[PDB]
Amino acid sequence: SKVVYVSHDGTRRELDVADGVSLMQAAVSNGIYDIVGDCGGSASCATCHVYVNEAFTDKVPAANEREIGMLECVTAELKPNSRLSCQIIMTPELDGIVVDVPDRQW
Template identity: 50%
Template sequence: MPDITFILADGNEQGFEAPEGVSVMAAATGAGVPGIVAECGGAARCATCHVYVDEAWAGKLPAPGADELALLECTAAERQPTSRLSCQIRLTAAMQGLVVRVPDRQY
């Protein structure tokens, strides 16, 4: 089970172990991480699970697909170079220590 840390918009951190194979979004919503709305439930249709992947991790994750890239154009918070939809990142053992930042808004 990889450890994952969410840095919230207010600077507080919430870290926990999450099972391999689940999305970062599912791990966040299951643990009650504030700021991850996940309105579409992980179907890559709404962009309300937008996160900023820590720069140290950005190049280690699989590249976003065309659908994810299109939705990232519609995020409420500013899109940054490390922006991702957390529903599209599936946790693996290699992601031990993953750090993501939650934007200040999803709407």
């Protein structure tokens, strides 16, 4: 699928996230996520907290409590679609997803 990542600083990236990848994984390989070593592509991170555009946040799978605190590690007023770069998976239909890292600290 077509996925696009936006850094909370205002940078954007667009990768190809097929079936079995996560918004992070693709970007990850692309270095988009040169963060720390928590999720390692398994949704165990406190820094990949990101906001998916409401359009791909409703199609994506339902994130579990593991995507709530991990993702809420940084007080970013967790939205309804917020999620750590490594928790949503991309299907061959949900393509065109736009991600964004929360600058909620501003």
